[PDB]
Design a protein around this ligand. Structure first.
Ligand SMILES: Nc1ncnc2c1ncn2[C@@H]1O[C@H](CSCC[C@H](N)C(=O)O)[C@@H](O)[C@H]1O
Ligand SMILES: [Cl-]
Lengths: 254, 78
């Protein structure tokens, strides 16, 4: 393939773009200060851009090569094409269009916290389930999971991921309110932002049986005081805190 | 937290996304699933004939992504 590089943005170069397509352009890419127009071959053009030959790289094999298993003991989060030879519990998650591939600190902190607190047979609420990864991990640990999300687009993705893992959590559209008729739960895990945890703290109390656990992450280190304050006001007892990079997980007893 | 690491702006012919450039390098740079985009974009634009489709791909910190397609550019339909 060849690229024709032009100075400017797509909005800024709008008027000349149909001429690039008429000339055989296969797609345009806005980069920093430039538009990159891709062609099978170069053509005589009136626009004063620059032609470069870019070869034909296997971008798919490159993507697979550079995506590695994500370790979160006792779990390992694997893409469908990955092999694994350790004693870790595998979680197969298709990297796709739902947050929760396993390639974030917060998802990993939550997986480790599930291992520490989940008793076999207990009911688990995964609030903000995304890819379904936490609900699926809960099932792998012998828990009975309900994954809920306000974003309806993620739920078919979570279902597909559960099938890849041979487990059967229940998935629902909605938030905490929608989950309440299915509880109370023994364990709540929620990877969400600090201000939402703070608002939800009284409702988290309602969602859990006495002796239950709330495992909260998605919290930037500097926003942790807000969540500690909220969970104190709502009657929770503090358990451990854990960190990875700028992110924290805060565990609470009901 | 769906922390955004990139917003990729492309213009592609309807139903003509491929894993070659631009989609390959553009999504590949940020570790996003190129083929998932190709499949999803082509399905979403399948009944648009030969229209040029502006698309914005929002790529998150864990390599997951979402996208939105826009209305054909002013020039085109103009
Ligand atoms: N008020 C709310 N109630 C339920 N889900 C919410 C919510 N606000 C945001 N969400 C969802 O919460 C998810 C957070 S991303 C976390 C995904 C996964 N549990 C993981 O740990 O990686 C997103 O999918 C988002 O749609
Ligand atoms: Cl390139």
């Amino acid at each position: 393939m060849w690229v024709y590089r032009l100075k400017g943005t797509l909005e800024a170069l709008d008027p000349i773009l149909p001429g690039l397509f008429d000339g055989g352009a296969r797609g345009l890419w806005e980069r920093e200060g430039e538009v990159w127009a891709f062609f099978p071959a170069p053509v005589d053009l009136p626009y004063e851009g620059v032609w470069e030959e870019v070869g034909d790289e296997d971008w798919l094999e490159a993507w697979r090569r550079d995506l590695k298993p994500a370790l979160a003991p006792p779990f390992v989060v694997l893409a469908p094409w990955h092999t694994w030879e350790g004693a870790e519990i595998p979680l197969v998650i298709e990297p796709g269009m739902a947050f929760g591939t396993g390639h974030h600190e917060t998802t990993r902190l939550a997986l480790k916290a599930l291992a520490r607190h989940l008793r076999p047979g207990d009911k688990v609420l995964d609030l903000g389930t995304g890819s379904g990864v936490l609900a699926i991990a809960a099932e792998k640990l012998g828990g009975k999971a309900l994954g809920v999300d306000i974003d309806p687009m993620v739920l078919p993705q979570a279902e597909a991921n559960a099938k890849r893992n041979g487990v059967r959590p229940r998935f629902l559209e909605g938030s905490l309110e929608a989950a309440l008729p299915f509880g109370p739960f023994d364990l709540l895990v929620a990877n969400l932002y600090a201000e939402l945890h703070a608002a939800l703290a009284p409702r988290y109390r309602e969602a859990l049986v006495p002796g239950g656990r709330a495992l909260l992450t998605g919290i930037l280190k500097d926003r942790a005081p807000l969540v500690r304050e909220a969970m104190a006001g709502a009657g929770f007892r503090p358990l451990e805190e854990a960190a990875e990079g700028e992110w924290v997980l805060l565990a609470y007893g009901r | 937290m769906k922390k955004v690491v990139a917003v990729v702006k492309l213009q592609l012919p309807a139903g003509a996304a491929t894993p070659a450039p631009p989609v390959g390098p553009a999504l590949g740079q940020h570790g996003a699933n190129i083929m998932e985009f190709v499949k999803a974009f082509n399905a979403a634009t399948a009944n648009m004939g030969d229209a040029i489709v502006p698309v914005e791909i929002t790529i998150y910190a864990d390599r997951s992504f979402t996208f939105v397609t826009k209305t054909p550019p002013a020039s085109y339909l103009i």
